[PDB]
């Protein structure tokens, strides 16, 4: 049904081997209580500092892609204080983001955003 | 404080002693009322055990690697309701005591002095309850800085912290007032009515346990007096910087 | 047109006080559309008949309806207010009427004026929330009292519960006066302590809809 | 004949919430003969002037009956009621005014109706006997709890007096939820919790004197 397409980095041979097509996200809700859901309007691309991911050492096979985001706040978790829905914010996704920036909606910690 | 909070079990012991004290005056509406009153009195162990358990939880959250300016107060929030749980029962037992003592007056007490003085004792009991409720409404309001303090009057409750130190220190004497008043009340009740061995059986434990509680209240009073300045200084890191510390559900993000 | 108010009353073994029913009914009903109802529509028995309340008791029997309305067929929403006079029999019928609970959650959530007098205050026992918490936990009020109950008591489990209901919630409050007019009006909740307390309490409700 | 009512107030700095005075005075004054009184007759100070009330307080200054007479020359027997508007400066003046003790106990001795709302309620602390035993021990009434006092600024021992006063009073459980209206009537005394509680309270007094 409704799906949101997200590009994922693959960790192989310590660097320079990133590839894959964007993979679906199905029925993603806005769970957690400080993470807000955005209608992403723009995603900037940056060279991935892969070596930093490797020594940073998280164990994923797929890493989320896209971190420099601008968009409109769709909805917020209950503990959110600085942000309301329909608000227009911009921000950096964290390096250890759960969700890719190459996607039209995003769940992101609220203190990575600014109006 | 956790060690002194353990002393409340002595209050629980004397409350059970108070139950058997009432059972003793049954041979000596009151007949249904005493059993109903006793059944409500049995509930206290259930009511008060979370109070001490929650205070233990507060101690668990006050452990190091956590700033705990007001953060550890979230357990205090549970503790506040737990203290409310105690005092609800105390408020639950408050009118029940007043009538019961009147029915205890209905029991043969030829001497007017014992009858009048125990009415004064019940009034004193009402007073100790009243200061105790002042503490509970205070502490429940003190839990509001932990979560969503819309009022934001950081300066106000910095001063407010002193009030229980005064209330608690006076409460030590108020409990002593109960103790001394009860001492002759129990003694005279032991002296004239029969079943002296049962009278001694209830009176010795209630009198000693209330004296132990007065010791416990004195420990709380001395404790609060020494640590009162530390808590007021602890709450406010700096001028206008206390409110930033008390900002809701940012400190939790800050702990993360 | 004049506005509407619901008067709920006991048909149980304990019955209803005649003077409370008189005072609640007459002054309100000229300034309200008052409608009297009972669980199961059971006919009323008057307790505490005296020379003072007798003529109205026969006026009650002889006036056109005289058969109470169904309480379980009442949707509160057309009524501006809810009123319960002093009903010692509250425990079985009114304290267990889930329909009365549903009207209370309607009125509670709509913050509409509710007025309960004396023993009728025990009738609010049915109105817990979805959790065990009562809908008027946070509200400050009075109840009949232990002091009223112990005098001419007839104690059993049933006298125990009716005071017990206010007694359980510490956020709820109880004020004890033996035979005294006592009225509490706290934000659309009016509570009278006893049969004497009836006249200002419903006037306060009258003021609420004034 | 229509009855007279004594209004005692505090005429020391920031001495009267304006909206409370406006309601108490204007609605009471049509059904009572009011006489306003302060210690020493010092000029009145208004708290909580409002744009709706700015014209009306300028009219009150224009009004001839704006002077506050000395309180200790007052004979209570002419006044059928006593009415206290919400006045923040009572907490220094009136809570320590022995003459207010003399008139309240006078009101007590004939069981004559008393009305105190909000901050003025703390003036009832003053009615000490020779011993600590209060004249209004058995009465149930409301008052200002820690809630409104904490939410507003409360330094310089301004609400400390009131905090201590609550404790001495018994069977008088101050309501929580500061912003909510609260009126309590128990045997000739009506008491309002706050400035919001002003409107029904004297109406309840009005019902008292009806």
PDB file of C-alpha atoms in Angstrom, chain B residues 29 32-33 36 40 43 47 88-89 91-93 95-96 98-99 102-103, chain C residues 146-147 150-151 153 155 159-160 163-164 167-171 173-174 176:
ATOM      1  CA  UNK B  29     -23.640   1.568  67.445  1.00  0.00           C
ATOM      2  CA  UNK B  32     -20.529  -2.580  64.994  1.00  0.00           C
ATOM      3  CA  UNK B  33     -18.470   0.627  64.871  1.00  0.00           C
ATOM      4  CA  UNK B  36     -15.702  -1.624  61.316  1.00  0.00           C
ATOM      5  CA  UNK B  40     -10.437   0.045  58.379  1.00  0.00           C
ATOM      6  CA  UNK B  43      -5.602  -1.306  55.938  1.00  0.00           C
ATOM      7  CA  UNK B  47      -1.435   2.164  52.916  1.00  0.00           C
ATOM      8  CA  UNK B  88      -5.696   9.829  53.297  1.00  0.00           C
ATOM      9  CA  UNK B  89      -5.922   6.985  55.774  1.00  0.00           C
ATOM     10  CA  UNK B  91      -7.845  11.660  57.321  1.00  0.00           C
ATOM     11  CA  UNK B  92      -9.877   8.473  56.960  1.00  0.00           C
ATOM     12  CA  UNK B  93      -9.266   7.699  60.590  1.00  0.00           C
ATOM     13  CA  UNK B  95     -13.499  11.607  62.266  1.00  0.00           C
ATOM     14  CA  UNK B  96     -13.612   7.938  63.176  1.00  0.00           C
ATOM     15  CA  UNK B  98     -13.396  11.590  67.288  1.00  0.00           C
ATOM     16  CA  UNK B  99     -16.610   9.614  67.564  1.00  0.00           C
ATOM     17  CA  UNK B 102     -16.785   9.906  72.482  1.00  0.00           C
ATOM     18  CA  UNK B 103     -18.099   6.355  72.656  1.00  0.00           C
TER      19      UNK B 103
ATOM     20  CA  UNK C 146     -20.044   9.746  60.020  1.00  0.00           C
ATOM     21  CA  UNK C 147     -21.418  12.123  62.689  1.00  0.00           C
ATOM     22  CA  UNK C 150     -23.843   7.333  64.126  1.00  0.00           C
ATOM     23  CA  UNK C 151     -26.891   9.186  65.545  1.00  0.00           C
ATOM     24  CA  UNK C 153     -27.736   4.646  63.214  1.00  0.00           C
ATOM     25  CA  UNK C 155     -25.434   0.262  61.195  1.00  0.00           C
ATOM     26  CA  UNK C 159     -24.383   2.598  56.343  1.00  0.00           C
ATOM     27  CA  UNK C 160     -20.649   1.852  56.120  1.00  0.00           C
ATOM     28  CA  UNK C 163     -19.899   7.491  54.129  1.00  0.00           C
ATOM     29  CA  UNK C 164     -17.082   5.238  52.846  1.00  0.00           C
ATOM     30  CA  UNK C 167     -14.056   8.606  52.713  1.00  0.00           C
ATOM     31  CA  UNK C 168     -11.989   6.643  50.138  1.00  0.00           C
ATOM     32  CA  UNK C 169     -10.926   9.600  48.024  1.00  0.00           C
ATOM     33  CA  UNK C 170      -8.668  11.887  50.001  1.00  0.00           C
ATOM     34  CA  UNK C 171      -9.027  14.452  47.227  1.00  0.00           C
ATOM     35  CA  UNK C 173     -13.647  15.875  51.329  1.00  0.00           C
ATOM     36  CA  UNK C 174     -16.136  15.308  54.137  1.00  0.00           C
ATOM     37  CA  UNK C 176     -19.158  16.685  59.801  1.00  0.00           C
TER      38      UNK C 176
END
